[PDB]
Amino acid sequence: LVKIPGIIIAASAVRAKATRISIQCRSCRNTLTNIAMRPGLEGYALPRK
Amino acid sequence: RIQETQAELPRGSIPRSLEVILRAEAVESAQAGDKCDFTGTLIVVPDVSKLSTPGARAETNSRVSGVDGYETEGIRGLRALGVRDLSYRLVFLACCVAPTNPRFGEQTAESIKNQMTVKEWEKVFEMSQDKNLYHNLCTSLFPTIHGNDEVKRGVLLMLFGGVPKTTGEGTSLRGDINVCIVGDPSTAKSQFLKHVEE
Numbered sequence: 001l002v003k004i005p006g007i008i009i010a011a012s013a014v015r016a017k018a019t020r021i022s023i024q025c026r027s028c029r030n031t032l033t034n035i036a037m038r039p040g041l042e043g044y045a046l047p048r049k
Numbered sequence: 050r051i052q053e054t055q056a057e058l059p060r061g062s063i064p065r066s067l068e069v070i071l072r073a074e075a076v077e078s079a080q081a082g083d084k085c086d087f088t089g090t091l092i093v094v095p096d097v098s099k100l101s102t103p104g105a106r107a108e109t110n111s112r113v114s115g116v117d118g119y120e121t122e123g124i125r126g127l128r129a130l131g132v133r134d135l136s137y138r139l140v141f142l143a144c145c146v147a148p149t150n151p152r153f154g155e156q157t158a159e160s161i162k163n164q165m166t167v168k169e170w171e172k173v174f175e176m177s178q179d180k181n182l183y184h185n186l187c188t189s190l191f192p193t194i195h196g197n198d199e200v201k202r203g204v205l206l207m208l209f210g211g212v213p214k215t216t217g218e219g220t221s222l223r224g225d226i227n228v229c230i231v232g233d234p235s236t237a238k239s240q241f242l243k244h245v246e247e
């Protein structure tokens with residue numbers, strides 16, 4: 001945890017980051033609802049099987 | 050594979066048979082039918098047991114839980130945790146082998162003479178020179194059976210055997226003596242057979 005002073009020289013538009021996702025299989029259509037995404041700049045590797 | 054001797058069977062029991070392992074010099078030191086005396090250490094050997102009842106799993110001590118889509122459940126989870134059944138057999142590891150009752154203290158007469166000690170050799174020589182050795186052997190071999198001196202003599206000659214031979218054309222001349230005893234019940238036939246065996 002860090003506390004720093006600065007000045008904001010830009011601010012991107014507000015976009016939608018998923019906190020939960022529901023992934024459905026193409027073959028059997030079964031779902032894997034409510035997969036907890038990590039917070040911040042980070043991605044998720046979908047299950048392969 | 051050896052099995053327990055009859056002298057140690059408990060009542061109404063079947064002999065226990067276990068496999069013993071011979072390594073290096075002793076590899077071929079035991080042959081079927083021998084009353085050997087294996088000296089070594091008992092050991093356990095992992096077994097692929099067919100027991101349908103789960104028992105004594107062994108798994109990792111690291112606490113790991115599968116993520117969504119890769120949960121530690123089923124064969125996947127068993128494999129991931131490295132679960133293996135701890136089923137074992139008891140096996141004997143014999144470093145040395147030897148007969149339970151040594152006979153002496155290729156094969157030839159000179160080989161036997163060298164193998165047997167001085168006292169045993171002199172005993173064999175003196176009994177060979179001894180007179181009426183035929184009757185002496187018969188009596189000393191059947192000290193409880195009365196009469197049947199002809200049967201005793203025939204069984205002794207059977208024990209000593211003949212001289213097997215092979216003809217030039219290949220046909221073999223059997224040298225072993227075959228003896229049969231026919232008679233009325235309670236005539237000591239089984240007694241002769243049991244004497245011969247023991």
Ligand SMILES: Nc1ncnc2c1ncn2[C@@H]1O[C@H](COP(=O)(O)OP(=O)(O)O)[C@@H](O)[C@H]1O
Pocket residue numbers: 193194195196197233234235236237238239240
């Ligand atoms: N001629 C004999 N001398 C000494 N004992 C005998 C004689 N005949 C029979 N017996 C005794 O009878 C018992 C039974 O004999 P057994 O071995 O059953 O003969 P078989 O098998 O021919 O019937 C034996 O235990 C033995 O001691």
Ligand SMILES: [Mg+2]
Pocket residue numbers: 238239
């Ligand atoms: Mg009989």
Ligand SMILES: [Zn+2]
Pocket residue numbers: 025026027028029030
């Ligand atoms: Zn599917």
